[PDB]
Amino acid sequence: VAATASEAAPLQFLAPYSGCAMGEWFRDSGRHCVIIYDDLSKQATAYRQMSLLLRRPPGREAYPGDVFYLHSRLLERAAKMGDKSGGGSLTALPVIETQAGDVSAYIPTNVISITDGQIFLETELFYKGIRPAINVGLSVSRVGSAAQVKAMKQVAGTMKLELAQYREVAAFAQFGSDLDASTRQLLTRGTALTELLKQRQYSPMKNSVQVCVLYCGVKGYLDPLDPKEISRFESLFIDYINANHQDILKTIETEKELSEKTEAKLRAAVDEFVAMNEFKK
Amino acid sequence: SVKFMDQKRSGEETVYFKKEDEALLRNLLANHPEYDPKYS
């Protein structure tokens, strides 16, 4: 649904409601859907424009006061219906561009205050080498583990804990002090995970493959390895398990958990892989 | 400067008191055997 800049203000103002209208067919008809509003601030720009050319009086930042009732109408149409209304769903993934990282503004504040989570993105992390540049401290999801597979819960709890510790300690660590091994292990594992969570553009991965990779990263098959080598460790392991161990992936996709059998099989596969391959450490 | 100072402080305190907690965990059960489940 393209409401571009040459397209008039009312079309830019109507496009997200049109998208929600197209998605309510799925939501009501027992099907599922996802809707991505891109440049949700241009909607508010267009509403400001309309009200100011209709001589309506402004508020703060020259916006009207009905911006909350502009976004609430729109985002309250996303919903998960019951088993009597079909069982459908409409997920929402709004997008917002801040200026100088100022999230103390009006529109960012409203939309953060009316959403079930946040995914912050930073330029410091985008240029340091972390791509996607997601800050996992500020980023949250109130739903959380309930929207997560058990196989992914098992790994991601430990991952979040380790990354919290690493984020706490790394700033002090970077000053050239000399630390014990219990802390050097924290730094090593945090660097490994930070180098694991990087991804190329238009290169998404399945859930089972994410599970396997984060297993390799969490059980310590990347701590001694060099940080710069993980970008090829990842791809070689992906190719290996996609070629010779699709059955493990199918089992994870079906059962949606990690039994001890799959645990042992995955560990054996990783051991075979490290045997067959060689890296800088 | 702000996040800089805060994170440096947090890391230093964490390391220091991690060491101290390790030491206290070493020397606890001797000086307080009434908690030691070895004698229970």
Partner: peptide, 12 residues
């Protein structure tokens, strides 16, 4: 902004 400059002045 203001909060940034005020916090910086306090810290310095």
């Amino acid at each position: 902004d203001l909060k940034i400059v005020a916090a910086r002045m306090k810290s310095v």
